[PDB]
């Protein structure tokens, strides 16, 4: 009596390094503290400094001219309310390509 195991792993799946992008996009503004930190993974924050950003980093811009990224800053209100997000690419915006060259 022989056991066939043959277990399939899914070489899919993102456990840990960076946030999926697909994966911040799971809270939205208006979402609290608690519910942020809940879907994000996020751990508990509550600076009494004033300083209520939550700073994520995921990959959309791998390589092309080396400096080229979004950052993606949460701000939530005092009440824990995301207030204003900030998220806008590395395509003139938030970010250029690097150094008017021409």
Same mark, same amino acid.
């Given at each position: 009596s022989s056991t066939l195991e043959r @277990? @399939?792993?899914?070489?899919? $799946?993102?456990?840990?390094n960076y946030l999926t992008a697909?994966? @911040?996009?799971? $809270?939205? @503004?208006?979402?609290?503290?608690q519910q942020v930190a809940y879907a994000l993974g996020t751990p508990l924050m509550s600076d009494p400094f004033g300083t209520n950003t939550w700073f994520y980093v995921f990959r959309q811009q791998p390589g092309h001219e080396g400096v080229t990224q979004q950052t993606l800053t949460l701000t939530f209100n005092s009440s824990g309310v995301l207030t204003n997000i900030d998220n806008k690419p590395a395509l003139s915006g938030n970010?250029?390509?690097?150094?008017?060259?021409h």
């Open positions: @277990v @399939v792993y899914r070489p899919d $799946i993102n456990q840990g697909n994966d @911040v996009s799971k $809270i939205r @503004v208006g979402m609290t503290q970010l250029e390509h690097h150094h008017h060259h």
